[PDB]
Design a protein around this ligand. Structure first.
Ligand SMILES: *[C@@H]1O[C@H](CO)[C@@H](O[C@@H]2O[C@H](CO)[C@@H](O[C@@H]3O[C@H](CO[C@H]4O[C@H](CO)[C@@H](O)[C@H](O[C@H]5O[C@H](CO)[C@@H](O)[C@H](O)[C@@H]5O)[C@@H]4O)[C@@H](O)[C@H](O[C@H]4O[C@H](CO)[C@@H](O)[C@H](O)[C@@H]4O[C@H]4O[C@H](CO)[C@@H](O)[C@H](O)[C@@H]4O)[C@@H]3O)[C@H](O)[C@H]2NC(C)=O)[C@H](O)[C@H]1NC(C)=O
Ligand SMILES: *[C@@H]1O[C@H](CO)[C@@H](O[C@@H]2O[C@H](CO)[C@@H](O[C@@H]3O[C@H](CO[C@H]4O[C@H](CO[C@H]5O[C@H](CO)[C@@H](O)[C@H](O)[C@@H]5O)[C@@H](O)[C@H](O[C@H]5O[C@H](CO)[C@@H](O)[C@H](O)[C@@H]5O)[C@@H]4O)[C@@H](O)[C@H](O[C@H]4O[C@H](CO)[C@@H](O)[C@H](O)[C@@H]4O)[C@@H]3O)[C@H](O)[C@H]2NC(C)=O)[C@H](O)[C@H]1NC(C)=O
Ligand SMILES: *[C@@H]1O[C@H](CO)[C@@H](O[C@@H]2O[C@H](CO)[C@@H](O[C@@H]3O[C@H](CO[C@H]4O[C@H](CO)[C@@H](O)[C@H](O)[C@@H]4O)[C@@H](O)[C@H](O[C@H]4O[C@H](CO)[C@@H](O)[C@H](O)[C@@H]4O[C@H]4O[C@H](CO)[C@@H](O)[C@H](O)[C@@H]4O)[C@@H]3O)[C@H](O)[C@H]2NC(C)=O)[C@H](O)[C@H]1NC(C)=O
Ligand SMILES: *[C@@H]1O[C@H](CO)[C@@H](O[C@@H]2O[C@H](CO)[C@@H](O[C@@H]3O[C@H](CO[C@H]4O[C@H](CO)[C@@H](O)[C@H](O)[C@@H]4O)[C@@H](O)[C@H](O[C@H]4O[C@H](CO)[C@@H](O)[C@H](O)[C@@H]4O)[C@@H]3O)[C@H](O)[C@H]2NC(C)=O)[C@H](O)[C@H]1NC(C)=O
Ligand SMILES: *[C@@H]1O[C@H](CO)[C@@H](O[C@@H]2O[C@H](CO)[C@@H](O[C@@H]3O[C@H](CO)[C@@H](O)[C@H](O[C@H]4O[C@H](CO)[C@@H](O)[C@H](O)[C@@H]4O)[C@@H]3O)[C@H](O)[C@H]2NC(C)=O)[C@H](O)[C@H]1NC(C)=O
Ligand SMILES: *[C@@H]1O[C@H](CO)[C@@H](O[C@@H]2O[C@H](CO)[C@@H](O[C@@H]3O[C@H](CO)[C@@H](O)[C@H](O)[C@@H]3O)[C@H](O)[C@H]2NC(C)=O)[C@H](O)[C@H]1NC(C)=O
Ligand SMILES: CCOCc1nc(I)c(-c2ccccc2)n1CC(C)(C)O
Ligand SMILES: CCOCc1nc(I)c(-c2ccccc2)n1CC(C)(C)O
Ligand SMILES: *[C@@H]1O[C@H](CO)[C@@H](O)[C@H](O)[C@H]1NC(C)=O
Ligand SMILES: *[C@@H]1O[C@H](CO)[C@@H](O)[C@H](O)[C@H]1NC(C)=O
Ligand SMILES: *[C@@H]1O[C@H](CO)[C@@H](O)[C@H](O)[C@H]1NC(C)=O
Ligand SMILES: *[C@@H]1O[C@H](CO)[C@@H](O)[C@H](O)[C@H]1NC(C)=O
Ligand SMILES: *[C@@H]1O[C@H](CO)[C@@H](O)[C@H](O)[C@H]1NC(C)=O
Ligand SMILES: *[C@@H]1O[C@H](CO)[C@@H](O)[C@H](O)[C@H]1NC(C)=O
Ligand SMILES: *[C@@H]1O[C@H](CO)[C@@H](O)[C@H](O)[C@H]1NC(C)=O
Ligand SMILES: *[C@@H]1O[C@H](CO)[C@@H](O)[C@H](O)[C@H]1NC(C)=O
Lengths: 744, 751
C-alpha cells in the first residue's frame, strides 16, 4: 500500500502518480520498481542531486506547476539518472535552463517559465533530444524584450524532430536548425518577415506553424497586437521551395490579404492548411492557390469576414473543384445571407468531402436540395445561422487555439448516419417545408432555436428515419400524444431544458408518445421541472434502456394525495439505468420505490435531500449493480445488507451525514467491489477492492489503530487519496493523514 | 413598539402589523387604541368572541393565510366589533361563510377557501357590504361539483358595488343581483351561455369580467379546459342592452370566433375591451364591432393567432379608424412576417394613439417610415420579433391574468420621450440603415439581440438624441474609444451582461467613450467581468451621478503589480452612488479606497469576501449617508466611529462574522438612523430609529438583561422581527426570542 503515490502497472512498467497531494518535497517513500513519476501540482521548491537517490530506473519525471515563489533545481541534479528520457518542467518559474541535464534525454518540456537565454551551455550536450518545448517563456514580460538564442544552439541536436518556440518574442526565425526537424512551431513569435534562407536545410519538415504572426484579433485567450497598419506577415516567394515533405501549414491569424500560389509549388503532399482569422474573402472568390492543393484533406478559412459586410451570397471560386482530396471544409464566420445550390457547385464533385462547417455565418436561406449532390457527406454543421421557419406560401497552453479540435457533432449522434446541426438558429416553429429536399438525416440538432411550439406529429415526416434527436434548450409545448410519432426509428431523444410549458398549469402535459417508439433506447427529460401529466400518469416502453429524470419534481408527483404517480416508471419494463438526481426528494414512499423497474442495473438518486433510505426494498431489485445516493442527508446504514442484495457491485454514499458503520458491514456483501463513504461524519471504524474514506473527520487516538491494522491486512482493497484521509482530532494530529500515526 | 406587533401611527389612527411572526393564537397584548390589525401568514387556528375583547376601535382585521388543518371561526365571533368595516379571511380553509358577521361590514374577502354554500344565513344581514370577494372556493375540487348560491342571497345587499365569484364552478350567472352593482367579476366560472335576463337591472355596472369561460389555452397559471368541440361562449344578442355605464368588458379566453356588434349598441362609454386568447383573426380583418367603440382607449387582441399560420401580412380592417378615442392597441401573438406602411393606414388618423404593442409576432421586416405618420405615438414595443440587420436601402390570485399589467417599457426610459423596444430581436449587428426613416427616439432597447459587434460610433447617427440606451444581454466588443460618441444628450447607459469580450485577452477594452458624454448621469457595467482596460486605465466624467460596477474583477484591477487602477473611479468627480458588490474583494488597498470620489453619498461593497475594513478612511468621505458591507467576512468594528463620520445615516453589516460591539459604538454617531447587525455572531450586546439583530446566536444568561433594559428604555428604536431575535444558549432557552426571559431569575455561567 504505497504512500503518498498511487503506484500502478502500465504495459511493461510501474507508474507513480503523486500529483495534487500538497507534497512540500519529493517523497523518498517511492517504490523501488518505478520507471515514471508524476509530481505535478505540488508545493516542491527544491530539486537536489539527492531528490531521486535510489531511483536510477526513472525514464520519465513530471514536475509541472511546482509550486502553486519559484522552483530551485541545482546543477546536475538529474545527471545521475542515466535512463531519464522524458523530463517535464512546465510552469516552474525557472529563470534559466537548468545546467547539467542528462544526455539520455529525448523529450524536454520547459513551457511557461522565465527562460530568456537559450544557451549552448544548457542544451547543446543533449544530443538525443527528439522533442523540445520552449513555448510561453519571453511572452509579454517587461524584463525580456526578446528571447536570446545563442547562434548554432540547435545544430548539435541532429536527432531533434520537434522544436516549439511558440509564444516567445523572437522577431526572427533562428538560423542553423537541424535537418532532422519534422515539426517547427513558431506561433505568436512576432516574426513578420520569412526569408528564402529561414527554412533552408529543413527538407524533412512535415509541419510548420507561423500562426499569430501579424494577427487578426477576434476571440484568442492570449494578447493580440496586430502588425502596424494591419499589415500581413511578409513570406518571401521561395521561402517554402525546399519544404517538399510539408503536410501541415498553419497560417491562422497572419492577416493575409493575398496567398502566393508559388508557396505551394514544391509541396505536393500538403494535407492540412489552416487560414482562419485572415482577410481572404477575395482569395476565396478568385483563389490561384486552390489549384496547388490536390492532396489537401482539411482546409479552414473560418473568420475571414469583411467587418460590416453582410453579402447576399458567398463567393466560392470554381477552383474549389481542384481540391480532389478534401475531406472537411471549415467556412465559419464568412458572414453571408443566402447559400444558393449554384454557390456550392465547385464542391459537389470532390469524392471524399464528409464535413461542411458553415457555423456562425448568420445565413437566412439555404437551398437544402444542394446537400443531395454530395457523394460521402456525413456532417452538415449549420449552428449559429438564422434559418427561419419554411412555409413559402485559465486555459490549456497545449491546445490548438485557432481550430475547433473537439467533434462538431456529438459522436453518439453522428454514429447513426448523416448529421444536420441547425442548433442556435431561428426555427421558432418547424414549418411544413422545413426538411423538404433533404437527404436521409439520421442525426438532427434543433437545440436552442427559441422554438416554443406544439407538436402534431407531422413536423418530421420528410426525414422520418432520425435516430438521435436533440430538442434541448427550447420551450416546446408537449400538449399532444402524437408528438414525434412520425419518427419510428428513433433511439435517442434529448428533451433536456424544455421546462417552460411543464411549469404551466393552463396547458396539458402528454408524454404518452414515448409508448409509440418500438426502437427507443435513451430518453433525457433532465431540467423540465415536471410536476404533472394529464390523462396518462405512467411512462411506458418495452424498449427504453436509460431514462434521465433529473431536475424534475418527483417530490410533488410521489406526494400526490391520490398516489397517481406511484408506478410512473414501472411500465418501463426494459429500463437498466434510471437517474432521479436533483428531484428534491426528502422521503420515497415504499410503494413508489417498489414500483421502480425490476430490470434496473444502475440507480442514481444523488443530490436529493433524503434523510432515510429503506434498504429492505433492495430485495425487489436482484439485477442492481450500482446504487448512487451521494449528496443526500442520510444518517443510518442497514447493518444487514447481505439479506437485501446479492447483486450490488458499487455503492456511492459520498456527501451524507453517516457517523457510524454497523459492526458487520465492511465484512459481508461478497458482491460489493466499490464502497464510497468519503465526505461523511465518520470519527472511527470499529469481496471489496475499493474503499473511499477521504473527507471524514477521523479521531486519531489509539482506537483508530484497529482500522489501521485492517488496512495493512487487506492490501487488495485500494483506498484512494490516502493524503486526503485526514485526522480532525486531536489538536496535534489535525492535518496528518491517518497513515502517519504510531503504536505506543 | 408593543410585542409582538410593530404598532405604527398613520393619519390620526394606529396600525398593528403582526404578520409572519409564527403566532399560535391572537395576541392579547394589542393596544386598545389600534384601528387596523394585520395577523396574516401566522399559525392561528381559533377565533372566539374573546379573541378581540375590548379592541372596540378596530375598523380592519386581516387574518389571511392562517394557518400554513383549518381556521375555526365561532358564530358571532366578530359581532361585538361594532365598527368593523374591512374583514379579510383569504386562504383560511373555511368550510362555510362564518355566521353572525357584523352588520357594519363594507368589505368582506373570503377568496381561496372551501365555501360551497353561499347562504342568506351568512351574508343577507350584511346590508352595508360594498365589496364581496368569493373567488377560488369551488375550484377544481372533487367534493364540490357546483357552488350552491341560495336564491335572492344578494338582492338584500342594496349597497353592493363589487361582487367577485371568479374561479368558481357556477355554470349559470346567478339571478337576483342588486342594481347597486358597478363591477361584476365572473372569470373562470364555467358559464357557457349568457341570456337576455342574466345582466338585466344591472344598469349601474361599469365593469363585467366573463374571461376564461370557454377558454383558449396558452400560458395561464391555472387549469384550462376548453368547451366541448372548441366551442366559444354563447352570448345572447341583447345580453348587454341595459349596461349603458359599462367602461370595462373582459372577454379574454372565451374562444370567440365572431363578435356580435349588437353587444355594443347601448354601450357608448366602453373605455377598455379585452379580447386576448380568442380566435378573432377574421374579426380583426372585417370587424363590424370596430364601428361601435367611439370612446374606447385600450383594445387588446393579443394571442388570436391561427395555429401554424405564419401569414406574410397582418390584415386589420379600415374600421380601426373608427376607434377615435384609442390610446393603446395590444396586438401581441398574431404572428406575421411583414408590417407594410399601408397595413397600418387605419391607425395613422386616430389622434390619441400613444402605444402600439406588436410583441411576440416574429415579424421579419417593418417599413419603419410608417411610425412618422402618427400624431402622439410615445411607445413602439417590438420585443420578441425577428428584425434583422438592415443593409440594402405560488401566484397572485388578485392579478389581471390575461393582460400585461406592468409597463411595456421601464418608466425611467419612457420619461425621456418616444420609446422603441427592439429587445429579443435578431439585430446581430446594427446595419447602416438600421434606424433610418425613424422618429426622434429618446429611449431605445436593444437588449438580448445576440449582438456581438464592434462599435465605430456611427451606428446611432440617424437617432442621435437617445437619452436612455439599453444594450444588456449581448456580447458587444468595446474595442473602440469612439463607441456611442454619436449619442450626445445620453443620460442613462445600460451595458449590463456583456462580459463575453471583457473576459477575452486577445481584444482591447476601451471605456474612454464615457468621457465624451457631457450629460451622462447613470452608467451600469454590472456582470461584465472587467479585469483590464487598454491605454486609458481610469473612468472619467464631470456629469456621472451613479456607477454600478458589480460583477466585475476589482480584485484583479486593485491587485495590479504597477497599481494602474488605484484611481479608476476618482475622475468621476460628480459621483454620489457607487456599487462595488460581487467583485470578489478580500482586501481594499487604503490608497485605492481613498481614491473613491469624495462626492459619494451611497457606497455598496456588499457580497464580497472582505476580512478587514479600515474604518479610519471614512474621514475622507464627509457626504457618506449609506455604507453597505453586508455579506462579507468582517470580524471587527471601529470602537470610535464618531471620529471618522458625522454624515453616516444607514450602516448595513448583515451576514458578517462580527462577534463583539465596542462599548462606545451604539452610543455616539448622532447621524446613525439605521444599523443592521442581523446574521452576525453576536453572543450579547453589553439618534438611532431602526436596529436589526435577528439571526445572532445570543447567550440568554443575565448578561442579555442589560440590553433588554435598553430596549424597554428606547422604545422609539424599531427592532424589526423581534420574533427572530433568538437565544442560541443556554439549552433551556435555545428557541425563545430574547423578549421571553425573566430578568429577576436567569443563570450566569454557560459562556
Ligand atoms: C378582466 O379585465 C379587468 C380590467 O378591465 C380586470 O380587472 C382589474 O383587475 C385588477 C387585478 O385584480 C385590478 O387591480 C387592482 O386594483 C386595485 C385598485 O387600484 C386603483 O386604486 C389605486 C389607488 O388606491 C390606484 O393606485 C390604481 O392605479 C394604479 O396605481 C399604481 C401605479 O401608480 C399601481 O400600484 C396600481 O396597480 C394601478 O396600476 C387603481 O386606480 C389595486 O390596489 C390592486 O393592487 C394590488 O396589487 C398591485 C400589484 O400586484 C399592488 O401594486 C398593490 O400594492 C395591491 O396589492 C397590495 O398593496 C396594497 C397597498 O400597498 C394593499 O392595500 C393590498 O391589500 C395588497 O396587499 C390591484 O391592482 C383592477 O383594479 C381591475 N380593474 C378594474 C377597472 O376594476 C380583471 O382582473 C380581468 N380579468 C382577469 C381574469 O384578468
Ligand atoms: C443598471 O443600473 C441601473 C441604475 O443603477 C438600474 O436602474 C435602476 O433600477 C432601480 C431599481 O432596480 C430603480 O430604482 C427604483 O425606481 C422605482 C421608480 O422610481 C420612480 O418612481 C417612484 C414612484 O413613482 C410614483 O410617482 C409617479 C409620479 O410622482 C407616478 O407617475 C407613478 O405612477 C408612481 O405613483 C419615485 O418614488 C421615484 O423617485 C425617488 O427617487 C429618489 C431616489 O434618490 C428619492 O429620493 C425620491 O424620494 C423617490 O423615492 C422615481 O421617480 C422606485 O419605486 C423604486 O423604489 C422603492 O421601493 C422599492 C420596493 O418597493 C425598493 O426596492 C427601492 O429601494 C425603493 O425604496 C426604486 O428606487 C431606478 O429608477 C433605475 N434607474 C434607471 C435610470 O432606470 C438598472 O436596474 C440596472 N440594470 C440591470 C440590468 O441590472
Ligand atoms: C497550427 O496548426 C497545427 C496543425 O497544422 C497545430 O498542430 C497541432 O497542435 C496540437 C496542439 O498542440 C497537437 O495536438 C496534440 O498532439 C499530441 C500528439 O498526438 C499524437 O499522439 C497521440 C498519442 O500520444 C495520439 O492520441 C494522437 O492521435 C496523435 O497521433 C497529443 O499528445 C495531444 O493530445 C493531448 O493533448 C490534448 C490537448 O490538451 C488533450 O485533449 C488530449 O487528451 C491529450 O492530453 C492528454 O495526454 C497528453 C499525452 O502527452 C498529456 O500530456 C496531457 O496532459 C493529457 O493527459 C494533442 O492532440 C497536434 O498534434 C498538432 N498537429 C500535428 C499534425 O502535429 C497547431 O497547434 C496550430 N497552432 C496553434 C497556435 O493553434
Ligand atoms: C441527456 O442524457 C443523455 C444520456 O445520459 C446524455 O448523453 C450521454 O452522455 C454521457 C456522458 O454524460 C455519455 O457517456 C459518455 O460517452 C463517452 C463516449 O462513449 C463511447 O466511447 C466509450 C469508450 O470511451 C465506449 O464505452 C462507448 O460505447 C462509446 O463508443 C465516454 O467517453 C464517457 O466517459 C467514459 O470515460 C470516463 C473516464 O474518463 C468515465 O468516467 C465514464 O464512466 C465513462 O466510462 C461517457 O461514457 C453517453 O454516451 C451519452 N449518451 C448518448 C446516448 O448520447 C446527454 O448528455 C444528456 N443531455 C443533456 C443536454 O444533458
Ligand atoms: C429592455 O428589454 C428587456 C427584455 O424584456 C427588459 O427586461 C425585463 O425587465 C423587467 C424589469 O425591468 C423584468 O421583470 C422582472 O423579471 C424577473 C426575472 O426573474 C421576474 O422574476 C419579476 O417578475 C416576477 O413577479 C411576477 C408577479 O406576479 C411573477 O408573475 C413572475 O413570475 C416573476 O416571479 C420581474 O417582473 C423582466 O423579466 C425582464 N425581461 C428580460 C427578458 O430580461 C427591460 O426592462 C427593457 N429595458 C428597458 C430600458 O426598458
Ligand atoms: C446540439 O447543439 C448544441 C449547441 O451547438 C450542442 O451543445 C454544446 O455541446 C458541447 C459538447 O457537449 C458543450 O461543450 C461544453 O462546454 C463547457 C464550457 O462552458 C464545458 O463545461 C463542457 O465540459 C463541454 O466542453 C457546449 O457547451 C454546448 N453548447 C451549448 C450552447 O449548449 C449539443 O452538443 C449538440 N447536440 C449534439 C447531439 O451534437
Ligand atoms: C400554445 C403554444 O403554441 C405553440 C405553437 N405551435 C405552433 I405549429 C405555433 C404557431 C402559431 C402561429 C404561427 C406559427 C406557429 N405555435 C404558437 C407560438 C408561435 C406562439 O409558439
Ligand atoms: C471581433 C468583433 O467583431 C464584431 C463585429 N462588428 C461588426 I460592424 C461585425 C460584422 C462582421 C461581418 C459582417 C457583419 C458585421 N462584427 C463581426 C461579427 C458579426 C462576427 O460579430
Ligand atoms: C530525413 O528523414 C529520413 C527518413 O524519413 C532519414 O532517412 C534521413 O536521415 C533524414 N535526414 C537527415 C539529414 O537527418
Ligand atoms: C478518398 O479517401 C479514400 C479512403 O477514405 C481513398 O481510398 C481514396 O483514394 C481517396 N480519394 C481521393 C481522390 O483522395
Ligand atoms: C394533436 O395532434 C393531432 C394529430 O396531428 C391533431 O389532429 C390534433 O389537432 C392535435 N391536438 C391538439 C390539441 O393540438
Ligand atoms: C420498508 O418498507 C416496508 C414495506 O414496503 C416496511 O415493511 C418497513 O417498515 C420499511 N423498513 C424500514 C427499515 O423502515
Ligand atoms: C378607541 O377605543 C377605546 C375604547 O374602546 C377608547 O378608550 C380610545 O380612546 C379610542 N382610541 C383613541 C385613539 O382615542
Ligand atoms: C346607482 O348608484 C347610486 C349609488 O352610488 C345610487 O344612488 C343609484 O340609486 C343606483 N341606481 C340603482 C338603480 O340602484
Ligand atoms: C384625446 O385625448 C384628449 C386629452 O388627452 C381628450 O380631451 C380627448 O377626448 C381625446 N380625443 C378623442 C377623439 O377621444
Ligand atoms: C488605514 O490606512 C492608513 C493609510 O492610508 C494606514 O496608515 C492605517 O494603518 C490603516 N489602518 C488600519 C487599521 O489598517
Amino acid at each position: 500500500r504505497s504512500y503518498p503515490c498511487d503506484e500502478k502497472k502500465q504495459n511493461d512498467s510501474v507508474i507513480a502518480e503523486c500529483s495534487n497531494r500538497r507534497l512540500q518535497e519529493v517523497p523518498q517513500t517511492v517504490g523501488k520498481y518505478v520507471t515514471e513519476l508524476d509530481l505535478s501540482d505540488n508545493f516542491i521548491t527544491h530539486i537536489t542531486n539527492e531528490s531521486f537517490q535510489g531511483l536510477q530506473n526513472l525514464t520519465k519525471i513530471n514536475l509541472n506547476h511546482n509550486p502553486n515563489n519559484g522552483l530551485n533545481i541545482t546543477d546536475g541534479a538529474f545527471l545521475n539518472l542515466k535512463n531519464l528520457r522524458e523530463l517535464l518542467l512546465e510552469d516552474n518559474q525557472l529563470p534559466q535552463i537548468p545546467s547539467g541535464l542528462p544526455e539520455s534525454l529525448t523529450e524536454l518540456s520547459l513551457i511557461q517559465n522565465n527562460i530568456y537565454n537559450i544557451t549552448k551551455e544548457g542544451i547543446s550536450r543533449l544530443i538525443n533530444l527528439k522533442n523540445l518545448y520552449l513555448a510561453w517563456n519571453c511572452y509579454f514580460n517587461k524584463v525580456c524584450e526578446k528571447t536570446n538564442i545563442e547562434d548554432g544552439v540547435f545544430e548539435t541536436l541532429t536527432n531533434l524532430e520537434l522544436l516549439s518556440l511558440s509564444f516567445n518574442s523572437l522577431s526572427h526565425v533562428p538560423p542553423k536548425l537541424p535537418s532532422s526537424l519534422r515539426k517547427l512551431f513558431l506561433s505568436n513569435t512576432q516574426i513578420k518577415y520569412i526569408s528564402e534562407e529561414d527554412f533552408k536545410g529543413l527538407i524533412n519538415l512535415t509541419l510548420l506553424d507561423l500562426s499569430g504572426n501579424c494577427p487578426r484579433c477576434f476571440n484568442a485567450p492570449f494578447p493580440c497586437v496586430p502588425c502596424d497598419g494591419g499589415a500581413s506577415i511578409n513570406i518571401d516567394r521561395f521561402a517554402f521551395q525546399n519544404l517538399t515533405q510539408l503536410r501541415y501549414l498553419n497560417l491562422s491569424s497572419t492577416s493575409l490579404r493575398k496567398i502566393n500560389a508559388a508557396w505551394f509549388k514544391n509541396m505536393p503532399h500538403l494535407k492540412v492548411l489552416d487560414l482562419e482569422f485572415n482577410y481572404l474573402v477575395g482569395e476565396i472568390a478568385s483563389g490561384a492557390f486552390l489549384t496547388m492543393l490536390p492532396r489537401l484533406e482539411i482546409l479552414d478559412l473560418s473568420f475571414n469576414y469583411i467587418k460590416g459586410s453582410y453579402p447576399q451570397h458567398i463567393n466560392i471560386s470554381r477552383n474549389f473543384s481542384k481540391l480532389l482530396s478534401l475531406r472537411a471544409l471549415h467556412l465559419r464566420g464568412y458572414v453571408f445571407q443566402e447559400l444558393r445550390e449554384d454557390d456550392f457547385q465547385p464542391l459537389m464533385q470532390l469524392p471524399n468531402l464528409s464535413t461542411i462547417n458553415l457555423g456562425i455565418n448568420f445565413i437566412k436561406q439555404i437551398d437544402f436540395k444542394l446537400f443531395q449532390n454530395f457523394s460521402n457527406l456525413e456532417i452538415i454543421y449549420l449552428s449559429e445561422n438564422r434559418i427561419s421557419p419554411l412555409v413559402k406560401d485559465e486555459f490549456d497552453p497545449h491546445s490548438n487555439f485557432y481550430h475547433f479540435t473537439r467533434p462538431l457533432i456529438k459522436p453518439q449522434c453522428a454514429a447513426y448516419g448523416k448529421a444536420l446541426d441547425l442548433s442556435l438558429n431561428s426555427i421558432f416553429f418547424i414549418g411544413p417545408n422545413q426538411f423538404e429536399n433533404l437527404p436521409d438525416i439520421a442525426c438532427l440538432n434543433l437545440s436552442a432555436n427559441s422554438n416554443a411550439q406544439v407538436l402534431s406529429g407531422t413536423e418530421f415526416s420528410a426525414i422520418p428515419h432520425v435516430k438521435y434527436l436533440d430538442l434541448t434548450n427550447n420551450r416546446l409545448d408537449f400538449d399532444n400524444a402524437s408528438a414525434l410519432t412520425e419518427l419510428s426509428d428513433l433511439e435517442v431523444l434529448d428533451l433536456s431544458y424544455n421546462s417552460h410549458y411543464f411549469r404551466i398549469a393552463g396547458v396539458t402535459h402528454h408524454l404518452e408518445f414515448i409508448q409509440n417508439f418500438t426502437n427507443l433506447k435513451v430518453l433525457n427529460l433532465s431540467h423540465n421541472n415536471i410536476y404533472t401529466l394529464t390523462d396518462k400518469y405512467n411512462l411506458e416502453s418495452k424498449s427504453l434502456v436509460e431514462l434521465v429524470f433529473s431536475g424534475n419534481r418527483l417530490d410533488i408527483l410521489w406526494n400526490d394525495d391520490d398516489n397517481r404517480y406511484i408506478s410512473i416508471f414501472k411500465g418501463l419494463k426494459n429500463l437498466t439505468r434510471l437517474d432521479l438526481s436533483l428531484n428534491r426528494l426528502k422521503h420515497i414512499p415504499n410503494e413508489a420505490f417498489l414500483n421502480l423497474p425490476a430490470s434496473l442495473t444502475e440507480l442514481h438518486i444523488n443530490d436529493n435531500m433524503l434523510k432515510f433510505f429503506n434498504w429492505t426494498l433492495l430485495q425487489q431489485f436482484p439485477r442492481l449493480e450500482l446504487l448512487d445516493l451521494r449528496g443526500n442527508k442520510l444518517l443510518f446504514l442497514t447493518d444487514s445488507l447481505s439479506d437485501f442484495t446479492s447483486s450490488l457491485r458499487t455503492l456511492l454514499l459520498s456527501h451524507n451525514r453517516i457517523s457510524h458503520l454497523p459492526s458487520g458491514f465492511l465484512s459481508e456483501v461478497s458482491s460489493l467491489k466499490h464502497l464510497d463513504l468519503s465526505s461523511n461524519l465518520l470519527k472511527t471504524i470499529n469481496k471489496l477492492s475499493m474503499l473511499e474514506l477521504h473527507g471524514n473527520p477521523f479521531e486519531c487516538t489509539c482506537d483508530i489503530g484497529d482500522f489501521r491494522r485492517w488496512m495493512d491486512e487487506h492490501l487488495n482493497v485500494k483506498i484512494p487519496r490516502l493524503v486526503d484521509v485526514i485526522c480532525a482530532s486531536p489538536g496535534d494530529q489535525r492535518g496528518k493523514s491517518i497513515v502517519s500515526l504510531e503504536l505506543t
